[PDB]
Structures are given as structure tokens and as C-alpha cells.
Symmetry: D2
Subunit: 462 residues, 4 copies
Amino acid sequence: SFRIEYDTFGELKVPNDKYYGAQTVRSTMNFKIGGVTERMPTPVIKAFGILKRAAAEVTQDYGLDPKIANAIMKAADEVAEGKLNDHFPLVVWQTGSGTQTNMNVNEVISNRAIEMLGGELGSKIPVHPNDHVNKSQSSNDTFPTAMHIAAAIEVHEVLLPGLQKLHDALDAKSKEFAQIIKIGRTHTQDAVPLTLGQEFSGYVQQVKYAMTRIKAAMPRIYELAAGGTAVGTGLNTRIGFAEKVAAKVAALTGLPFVTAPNKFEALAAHDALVELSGAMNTTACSLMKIANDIRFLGSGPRSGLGELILPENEPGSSIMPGKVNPTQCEAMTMVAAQVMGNHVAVTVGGSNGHFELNVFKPMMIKNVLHSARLLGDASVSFTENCVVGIQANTERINKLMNESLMLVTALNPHIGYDKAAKIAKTAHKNGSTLKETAIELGYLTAEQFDEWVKPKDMLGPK
Amino acid sequence: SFRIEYDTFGELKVPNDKYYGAQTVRSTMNFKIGGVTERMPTPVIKAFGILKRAAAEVTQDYGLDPKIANAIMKAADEVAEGKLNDHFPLVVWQTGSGTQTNMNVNEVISNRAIEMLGGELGSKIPVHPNDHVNKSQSSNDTFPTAMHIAAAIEVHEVLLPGLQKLHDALDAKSKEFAQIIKIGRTHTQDAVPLTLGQEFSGYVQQVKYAMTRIKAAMPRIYELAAGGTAVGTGLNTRIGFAEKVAAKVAALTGLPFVTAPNKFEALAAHDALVELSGAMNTTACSLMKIANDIRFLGSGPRSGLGELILPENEPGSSIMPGKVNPTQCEAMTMVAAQVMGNHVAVTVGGSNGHFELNVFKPMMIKNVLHSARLLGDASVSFTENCVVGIQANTERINKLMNESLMLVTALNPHIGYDKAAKIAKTAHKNGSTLKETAIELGYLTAEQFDEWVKPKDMLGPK
Amino acid sequence: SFRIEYDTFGELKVPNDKYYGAQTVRSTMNFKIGGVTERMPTPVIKAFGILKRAAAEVTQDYGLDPKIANAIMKAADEVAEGKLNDHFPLVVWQTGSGTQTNMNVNEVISNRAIEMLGGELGSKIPVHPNDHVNKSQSSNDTFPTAMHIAAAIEVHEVLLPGLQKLHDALDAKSKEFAQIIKIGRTHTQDAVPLTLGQEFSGYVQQVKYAMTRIKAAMPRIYELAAGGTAVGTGLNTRIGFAEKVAAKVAALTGLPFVTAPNKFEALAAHDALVELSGAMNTTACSLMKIANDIRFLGSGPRSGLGELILPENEPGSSIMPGKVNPTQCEAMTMVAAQVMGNHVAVTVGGSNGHFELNVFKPMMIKNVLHSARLLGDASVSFTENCVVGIQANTERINKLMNESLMLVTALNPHIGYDKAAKIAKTAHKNGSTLKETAIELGYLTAEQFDEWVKPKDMLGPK
Amino acid sequence: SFRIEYDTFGELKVPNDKYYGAQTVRSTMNFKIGGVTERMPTPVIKAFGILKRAAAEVTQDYGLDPKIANAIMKAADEVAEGKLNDHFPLVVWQTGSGTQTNMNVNEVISNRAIEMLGGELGSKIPVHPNDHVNKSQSSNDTFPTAMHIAAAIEVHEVLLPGLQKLHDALDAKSKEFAQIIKIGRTHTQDAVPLTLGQEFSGYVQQVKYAMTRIKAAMPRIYELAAGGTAVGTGLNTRIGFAEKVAAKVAALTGLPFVTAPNKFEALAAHDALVELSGAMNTTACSLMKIANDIRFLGSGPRSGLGELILPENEPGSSIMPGKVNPTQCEAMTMVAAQVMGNHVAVTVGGSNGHFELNVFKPMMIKNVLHSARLLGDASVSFTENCVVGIQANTERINKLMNESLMLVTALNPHIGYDKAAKIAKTAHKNGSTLKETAIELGYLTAEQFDEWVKPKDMLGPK
């Protein structure tokens, strides 16, 4: 079943079980680009719910009937709470201001509010999509507001909590591995030792700094454009509206949202999203290093490095013992690469503003939310299904410590540099160890080697 | 209702109305990254259907029971034809080889084939996911095969047909506008004239070259990895299998698919996808120019350039006549920016292969298919909802031709350079036209101006 | 005219008039990639001079002879001061750790110090390149230190000062234009009014936030790797060296350098350079918008927007009055594009660390310094040669204000929406002004139009 | 030591020993962005010399005095031959059309030709920079021509020859290693065997396809804009000039240059440079994989993979036998990252054309030439200083083959899967070899293992 609505181009059938109206149906026909995977991110829709709630509450002061305003606030809450996601079928690839989604939100909130008040759907009575739900608003300043509400909420609920879990798990392994001495690798060549915990402490620092970098990129995300209306002047709205809407959004979300000090910078550009994307771009570089390292450190069982034993996430064959594919490392490094491409997409859009309005908004916030969700989700997955279950192959690590040529410099003050190079060059030529060689040349006894060559003493300055 | 299946980690409930098995259910739990918008692109799933059809038909030669092989072929066809899309819930962000989706396809095809043969779902009887559906195959060589089948089909059915429509529509407008002389713009400054059709012929050429560039990037997309098995050697398969599978895929699709001459290059890298993405990256640069030009040429109605009258796609207010937002230009330019970011994502993944296997496959093909779909769909939308309806504002174009200072050089051979600069500098100072100025200074009569100053003669070399 | 020096691989001719030695000559033979334009950036060389000056003063505590330490310090000062630039022929495309430039610096300082002490160039007497100039230092922790010193100096001396000049000049113009009312543009379509000062105040905010973002990306640039030695443990350096050399660098530069609290994160990755590049990538988006807007606002003289008169710095043609190509806008927007590409280069390198050492260091700092130099210099050139001299074309702005159809809404309270719309639709049809039209229809008097239509009242909330 | 020249803005001191004139000096004052490393690439300057040589010979048909044309041609030849490089001080960051370098070339050629004719430098007598050297040319269609000439020459002289050397050296090693069997790596985990020759044959295919991709991106580079004049119409040039100058360039260079069939597409965009950059971006992905693989395959000597012995070009430490940093791999992988960033820079510029002229030309060709030079030079250096000298560590490969758990499947037909798996799980547990284990359990004899386990039979289909 369907109802009949009209726009300036013709009549449109609107499904009776849908709260959107003719303007949304027209948008689904004029913007058939990409399919359902391209739908406007739900976080933006929910952020509009919060936003329309705050606006309706403020415009009450300016005459808006409380019976209507309260119905708008109730319907807005349902959008914010994810109760009406099925009534937003529009894709990212619409107008660059996000007008169609703003209209989508206005139509859904009015028809739902109309229903709450016993009215007829599609009639704009008593709740009018533009005169009431969009009162004192514009697509140009509401969509940017929704972008920053959505990004802030995603950062604080998904991105940062995910990185925190990865940080804590990496820190636990650093402490767990504090006593395991292994051979370092510089240029991928054997190098002087360090503890597996020291190496992991570097990953911990990178994730710690990743969270600091994301937080340092949030202050200007908290600035809201609501109040600039069409070009940033605030024409057709009341003094104090901008500040009151921001304070209301801050109270509803619990986050320190504020009104943008300059609404022209807030409409004509989205450099804060470029900034936030850049912090996630750095995070991706950090997580690419961490994941690839763990990937190669777990390589083996015999023709790789074999320092780490990663948990199984795929069925391991009985005839292939010890073989574990680093599946989560692969998901994480693919996510990292994706974030890097998304950042360039954000950068191109952020650079192409025209005069009073940047009209790349939907694609910029899509890429920002995409990266934040992937990094957060991937961090959790990488933590629970890999990091927490990493074990050290101490037997193989200690074996390659005894077989390494790197510890020969510990003999320098006892038998001389030249005699040390002879042990090194000889063991290298013969393929044996340093101790077996040093003994068979008569340079020292086995008990002298054990006393002179101590890797535990090669882990810091003196 | 659900059935019980097991993997090496525990028992799993499998919905009875689903054809996938325990391995897929385990993948949905171990790879909760991004949500439903991150599901493996349907074109890859359908390409697996084609692929599993071709393999089952070839392995018949190697003993596979025809009753089983025919059931696999029937089930494979249903996947290829899009009849079973609801049985593939896995996201791009899985293992870098695409193993989980290969398992997803093998489970769905066996359970469906089992159903066709009157067996019990989840039993692997008589159709075994690995021994029968995955016979002589590996995730390492089947997923690359599916990537290239999907990319080729998308290029030929979506991308190129969309660009062809945009090309034809731009060509029609070039011919329609062949006689409309306007002022050129270099550095955005007024310049010598050219026809609106000449300017549009440049857009036509860019789209024509875009199609040539995409086609020139397809020869190596037609190379299929099927037959390299785990590392490219073709271990555990029969001589001629690689060629027969490729010829079968070519026959099923109607496209010139061939087996990759070097299976190690086909598994260890995906430089063909980087190549194809680069051609779409060029296309995006072309379409960014075309769309932004049309955007600015339609700016107005009075404080812009106002050369073009774009069709309305949003409701136009009665009190705002002549104001038309270039909505499709904004969708197209956002798509262009997205393609540029996707290309970088493809580039990072394509560069990070390790030894015998590049394990960034799902994210690379996702970004490739994303760009191809968006460019194709956006081309159609931009054509039908903007280009075909563009009109020239001949009145405003001709008015600015009479008011332009650029045509003064046509007077050079008649009244001298110095006398021409006087008319120019005077009209510029006074804000009048060249004809009104040239007359009031007594340099020539109105009938001499009309005869000497002819823009139709300023459109080519002499 | 050469001297003969020796390394382990044989004989090498060194020009008598160069201070570098055999190792540098060896490096020039094995890394002939790109030519002179690819030489290691001078700021990196100067930063090395600061570092070697700092180390030499600190290592006197370890027995370094004061007479030699004093000569090393004097020669290091000459390097830091840009006096020995012709003695560094190595390209960026060398060892990924920068070891060879470290050896280049050690040899130049050693031979210059030898010269000051009356010794023979190339003898290593009395100043040894490794035992004295490289004392307590590693071939892995010195280059990361140098590039952070160089990055910090370039930010504070070039990048921020350049952005500060641009901020101030834009702010002065924002005030000079605070009363010039123009027609706003959204989607490039005519929109409600705003002043040039308001529009320019958005540019000012963008530059102010750019400087904030760059400063917010510096805290981890000030962390120095010096002391981590080969793999980050500090093996074979002295306790307290790390903190002492960093404090000496801070005192020599007046910048808050400190030792890196985790040397493994400091050697294995350069996320700080990625962070700083990201800040400059956001800045480039801001400058692209500003420069491109001023570009189009100055378009004309007659077939463009024509709101701004940009300074003419290059030669015009007397026959072309009014035609000024915005060449400073082109240099700026080209620089912005370069910074965006540079950022991807930095991102790829930063993502590809391996275990204990990221070996993409030279190319990472090269792109960071390149972007910082271009942004800083372009901001000065754009300021001095364009912004400070921008003039408003008030005569044309006033004409376009009077001819705009946007102000028609001011008549709504006085003659009703229905009648205002009739005026706009008629003015649009006849190509006349709102005032002329509203009078011919007889809906108001000329004195009534001037009293009701006041753009000065349409510039903010009420 | 200066001379005094004059432009419309006053007096300018020109060094007596320079051939450039007032306009060039003016350009050096207004565009002080970046310094000498940012000077216009020399290949662009040489290409201008070819172009001006071609134009001068053709314009004799238009009355150009042969005695002057001959001097222009001789001076243009000196520019093309790299003999007047010190007379071009302008940076890339100039007018987006490259006009000032065009004037730089016109002044240098004019003053050098004046000198050859016994005239006074700076007098424009008898050789005028614009009336003679720039005859029949525009300030907009000359730079696009020059940068396509430069791009084509650099591809054919530097890029492809470098890739050809790398292809050939990799192919020779593929054959030298055709019988050395090693353990394959998928996901970095141990996998079924393949030969080093097979693995290397993949690298060979990648380079072969890279050269194909680059050549496939050239056809539209050979299209020259010369003749389109200011906006593409060819106004104020002669019929036949476009086709004649292009054929003269083709004859002078031996490359298939032709006039662009659509001069509007040729001036308004540089999609061909984006296409060519994309080809080099694919090449960079290929070289990253090859260089990084060889990097890790040479990792060791003992705590890495250790399959390859790379040539040692820099100084080792006698105490560190076997430690060879893969420095050529680092220069190559850094170059690859740079090319990827360069491509985004080219992409952003190529996307930002405006109507009749893309004014990002200098930065676009700079990045194209930069990538082509680095790729070509790095391929030669990587070839001569690494690839040709790579040796296989056959002793270690054989040891790791015998210690691998991967070959255990060869025992399946002889003792059954159940028993083979028992051997693998035991060898893995005890850390012993398959042979040792299979004997202690008594499942076979040593002579039986050698007859059944033949890796030479596991290298292809059957």
C-alpha cells in the first residue's frame, strides 16, 4: 500500500509504512548512485535527531507551539535513538550540502510527530517539515552541525575506546615479555639485543600517542555551525539562537559542544574534518607498523622468524602443526590502507570549497566516519582475537640467541677486538655458534664465555 | 529455528534458512569490522558463482561425479545470477586472501547442491565444500580470479556504458551549441572568444579518452590466476586445468578471459587492479573538470557567470526565479574526489605484497568496484538529470559579448593599435561598451564597428 | 686536483677542495639517483651541525680532549650556519636510515677541524670522524634527531611566520572591507548578502586555526632519538647522554627539545612527521580555498565575478585594460596540491617501518621540509604580492547589488510574499532590476523601495 | 656587474653574464618560493629549446628573416643541449600556465642570438624575444607542448631504459636460480615449495608489464598543444603551423609527436600527464614489492630468512661477518613511496582545470618528471649495485628445506595421512626434522624417505 504525495515535478507514490515524504522519494530517483552500501551513515541520521531535538526546544522560546514542539522532540528522540533507521534511504552521493538528508529528516520527524498527534501522514498538518521542524535552520548549517556531532560521538564511543583496549593489551604483553631477550633487527639485519617487552613498549607508545593525536584534533570538531543559516550571517534567526542550540546539544550528548566563533569558516570549509582525518591517518601508519611487525614476528613455523605464536582464528590442519595465518594482522593492515585512501578523499573535498559553502560535506563525513568505525572496530578485533593470546616462542628465541653472531662484541674487553672478529668470521664460515668456535680456537674456556657474554647486560647504557 | 554445526573452536548455531555453514558463522564473529556497509561486494560473490561453475565443469574430467558436479553447477549459477545474495554476510575486512568468502561460497554452493539432491543441510553429504566445490582450488588463486571477473564485468556493464552515455550527451550539446560565440576564460580572466560547442567538444574528448584509458587498462584484468593454487606452482592440480578454467569462464561471460602467463605475478601482486584504478583516477580528474566547469558556467542568476541554464532537480521557490543549484555537478565532483582516495587505498594495498601472496585482496577489489560503480552510476545520473537538459543563456552570452573588452583587437588593422587601446582604456574607465566609446571619440562610425568587429571571424587560425 | 683516501674497498679520489672523505665519495658512486635537486635538504645538514656541536660539548665529560672538542664545535658551527653546504653531495635516495649523510657530516666536520688544527685533510689526525665527531652516537639515532631539529626550526622560522603574515594581511583587509556588502554565493548560486569583511574573516579564521593545528602537531617533534643508539636500548652510550645532548640542543636553538621517553617508538617509527605533515595537509586545504576564492572573486574584468581588483605585478598589455591574471593565487594553489601529494609520500614511508628501525627517514623529512618551505614562502609571496594590495571594486559590487534578485524578500512584510514573487519573476523575465519592476507594476514608490530594501539590515541575527 | 633593462614597471638590473632579461628578473622578484631546488626542471628547459628551434624553422614561411631564424635556431639548439642551464632561475611555483618560463626561454634565446649576431645584450636588436622567438606562439600553448616533449624524452631515455636493465637482470637471476628449491611463504607462513627462479620470474613479469603500462600511457603524451594559441581556437596563428611544428619536433626528436586533435582538451586539462603518472604509480607498487621481498630474503645472517646474499657496497665491520644492510632496496622503496605521493600531487592539479586553461602546469610536469627520473635512476642503481650480484645461500636454503614441516604430505600415499600427521606433530613438538622423526617412530627407512620425499616433484601440475 502507498499514499500519494506531490512535488513540483509530478506525483509520487510513498509507501504507507514509511515516514519520509515526496522530497525523499524524488531524491531516491534523482540520485541512483552506488546502491545501499552508499546510504548516508546512520551516525549522521542520529546526529540530526539530536540536532532537531535541540532546535525544536530552543524555537519554543520564539513562539513555536509546545504541543507541536514536544511532538517534534519526541520524534527527534526516536531518530537519535536509532528507532527509525529504515526511513532514510538516501545515499552519500547527493547534493554537496546534504540538503536531501536534511529534508529526509524533516519529513520523517514531521510525519512521525503528526502520527503522535493523531494526524494524517503526508499532510504537513499540524507539523510542517520546513516551517516547524526546520524552523530557523538551513541545510547549510545543520548538516555541518550533524557532521561534527556524529564525528565527536563516534570518536568517543568507538574509536578511542577501541584504541584504549589495544593499548592496554599491548601494555600487558610488554610487561609479560619484559624478561625475554631477543635479537633486534635494523634494516632487517641482525642487530644488538632488546627485550620483547621493550619492542612491545614501542607499540604501546604509538597507540598512546595515537589517542593523544585524535584528542588534539577534537577541539574544533566541538564547534557547531548551527546558527549561520544560509551563508553564515545568521539571517532569519534570533540573537542567542546559535549559543542556545549548542548548549542544548552539549547537554543532550554530554560532550563540550560550542558554537563556532566564525560561522563563515564553519560553512565554507570543513578543515576540522581534514584535521581529524589526518590524526586517523597517523593512527593508521602506527597500526600498520604494529600489525605488520607482529605478522612477521609470527612468521614460520620454520622458514620465518618464529618469535611469536599467534592465536588460531582459522581451522588449523592436523598435518600442518604450528602453521597459523595472522588473520587479524591482515584485517588491520587492510583497514590502515583504507584509512589512508579515505584521508586523501577527505583532503580533496576539504580543499574544494567555493565562497560561502563547501559542497562536499556528505563524502567528507562519510570517509571520516568510515575510518573511525574501521579503526575502532579493527582495534577491538585485533586485541581480542590476536594480541591478548600472543605467546613468545622462548625456545626458538633463546636458540637463535645462542646461534647469533651479534653478541661477539661482549668479548672485546677480555680477548681483544681482533680475536673477537676471528671467532665471528670463523663461526660464520663454519656455520657453528660463537661459543663452540671460541673454544675450538683456544681463545677461552666454556666457563669464561658464560661469564663474559651476558645478554642481560647489553640492554641499556652504562 | 537453527541447526547445529561445529568447527575446531566450538559449536555454532546456523540459521536453518541460510545456506552458509560453521566457517561463515565463525567469520561473522571474528571479523566484526564496520557493519553491513562493509559486506563483500555482490559482484565478487557473483564472480565466484561463475568461477565455481567453470571449475566444477572442468574437474568432471578428473573423476568428479556428474550427479554431484551438475548440482554444483546449478547452485553456482544461482550465486552468479544473484539469487543467493542473502547468504553472504562477511565483510571486506577479513583475511587478505579472501579465504573466508571462498569458504562462504563453498559452504553455500554445497548446502544448496545438497538441497537439490535431497540431502541434509550442514552435513557435507553428498556435496563436500572443500573436496568437491573447492576441488583443485585455493583461496589464493580463486579470489584473484573472482576479483578480475568482477572488475571486467563491472567495467563493461556499468562503467563504460555510463561514460558512453555522458559522451553522447556532451557531443549532442557541443553540436547544439556550435554557433553560440562566448568569451573564453584563461586564469579565470576574460580572453578571446570560442564557441560554447568548442568548449563542450573538449569535454567530449576527455570522456572519449577516459573510455580509451579504461579499455587500455583491461588486457591484464583478463588474465586469471586460477590454476596457481597456493603459491603459483599449480601443485595438486592437472596440466591444462588453468587453461580450461579460463576458457570456460570466457565462454560463460562472453569476455576474452585468459590464464595468467605467470601465476606468481598473479598471486603475489595485483598491479592490474592498480592499473585499472589509475585509469579511473584519470577519469575522475576529467569528470571533476567537466562538472566543475558546468557548475560555474551555470552560476547566477545575476552574480555569477550565467552562461548555462541547468535543469531543476530540487523544488525551485516561486520568489527565487532563475536560481538552480547544480545538484548533479555536486554528486559527480564528490564521486570524483572519492575515486581519488580509493585509488590511493588501492595503491597502498598493491604495494604491500609479501613473497608469494599479496594479502590485501578484498580491500583492493572493493575500492576498484566502488570507483567503477560510482563513476558509471554518476555518469548516467549526470547525463539524464543535467547534461541533456542544459540550455544556453544566449541573451546573457550575447550581452556580455557586446560588453566585453576582449574584441578590441579586431580594430587593429583599421584604426591602429594605439587608437584601439584608447577605446579600451576609455570604455574600461567609463564602464561603457567598445562601440559606444569608439563612436563618442570619433574614431569610427557605428556601421564601421559592425563591419570590422566580427567575432565569427575570431574562432580559428588564418 | 684530488687527494687519495682509503676505505676497506680500496682507493678513492677526493677533491682537494672538499672536506668530505672516502665514505662520502663511496656513497656518491652507489647512489646516483636524481641529481643535484635531490641532494639532502640543507636544513637537515644545518641540524646535523647543531647536533654534532651539542654532542661534542657533552662528550668532553667522557674524556674527549678539549682542544679537539673545541675544533669539532667550531667546525660544527660552520655547518649549522650554512657555510659548508658545498661539501654535502649526497641525495635523499640513500640508506633509509640516513647513515651516509651522518658519515658525510662526520667527515666534513673532522676535516674542517683538522684544517683548523693545522693537520692534513683526510688523515683523521687529530680529529677522527667516528671516534670523536660521532662519539657516543649511533648511525641510527642521529639522523632522526637531525630531522626533528630541522623540522622544528623550519616550522618556527619559515612556516608559522609566513602563515602569521598571511593571517595579519587577511585580517587587515577583513576590516577594510567590513562595510562593503556583496551578494553571497552558495553552490555558486546567488545567495543572501554578506560583507567582504565577513567573507574575509572566514579566511582569517582558517589561517589562525592552521597555525594552531601546526603548533598542536609539534610536541612530539621536540622528542629526540639521540641516545637510543642502534636499536633503542642505548647500548654503548653513556647514562645521561640522551638527556644532556637534548638539553644542549634546546639551549642552542631556543626550542623545547627533550629526549624521547621511548626510544623504540622513536627509531622504529616517525609518526610525529606524519602528524606534522597532516597539519600542513590541513593548512593546504585552507590555503586552496582562500587562494581559489580570491582567484574567482578577481575574475573579469567583465565576464567574471569582478568583486576584487588584484595587484598587477607582471606586465600587462596597454590594449588589455583591467586584465590581471591572479598569478600569486596560482603559485599558492599549486603549492597546496604539492603539499597534499607530499603528505601521501610521508604517509607511505611512515607506515613501512620494520621492527626496530623505520628506514624511510630521508624521504620522510624531505617531504616534510619541502611542504613547510613551500607553504611558508608561498604565504609570504601571496601576502606581499597580492593580499595587502587587494582592492574592492565597489562600483561593480554596488551595481550587482542593485541588479540582484535576492533582496526581493525585504518587500514581503510591506507588500506580501505574493506580490514580491511577482516582481522577482518579472524582473527575471524582462532582465531588469527589482526596483524598476516594482515601480512599473505600481506596487510601491521609488522612495518606498529605498526605505524597505536596506541590505545593511540583512547581515546578521535580530 | 649588471646591465639595465626596462619593462613597463621600471628599471631592473640584469647581470651582464646572464642571457635572460627584464621579464625574467621581474619573475624572480615576485616568485621567491622554495629556492634553487625548486627551479624549473632542466628537461622542460631543453624541451623548450627543441620547440623554439622547431617554431623558428617553420615561421620562416611567415617572413621570418633567415639570418635571424638561423641565429634563433642555433641558440635554441644550445638550450636543448643543456648548455645554457644557468640562465634559467625561475621556480616551478610561478604562473600556473608557465608563461614566465616561456618568457625566460624567449629572452635567453634572443640575447644569445643577439650575441651571435654581434648585437647588444638586452637591446632586442636584431632578435626580439616575442616578435621573433615567440612568433606564431601563445603564452598558453607553448608550455604544455614543452612538458609533453620533456615527458616523452624522459620516458624513452631514462625511465624505460632503466626498467629494461632491471627486467633483464632479474630475468638472468631467474634462470641462474631455476633449480634452487626453497620454501614458499603465504601470509608469511611456511607454504609448499617453489624455486627462486620461479619467484624471481614473477618479479620479471611485473617489470615487463610495468614497461608495457608506461608505453600504453604514452599515445596522448605525443599530442602537442602548439597551435591552440590563447584558448584553443588557434586565433592569431597560421593555418598549418600546428601540424608543421609538431612534425618538426617529431623529426628533431625521433618520437611520434603529432598535433592535438582537440586543442581545448589539450589546454584545459592535462589528463595525459595524470595517465602517465598513474602508469608510474603502478610501476612503484611493483618495485616496492620486488625491492621489499629481496630486502627480507636477504635478512639475516642468522635471525632472518637468509635465502639471498646481497652485494656489499658500503663498509662492513670486520667484527660483523655476514651483516649486509640492503641499502639499494631502501633507496628503491623510498623512491616508490615518493612516486605515489607525486601521483596525488599530479592528480590534484589535473583535476583543478578552469574553463579554457588548466593553470597547474608547472607542478604537474615537475612531479611527472621527478617520478620518471627517480624510477629510472633507481632501477639502474638497484640493478647494477644489487640485482646482478645477488647470490643464493644454497647451504642455508638446503638446511631449511630439510628442516621444513611442509614436505610431510609426500608421505601420504606411502604411509597414509594419519601417519604423516603423526610425524609432523612430533617433529614440531620435539623440534626435529621430518626424516629424523619418521625414523624413530619406525614408519619408514632413511632410504625410503629420500625416495618418497622429492621436492623436485612438487614444483608444478601433473
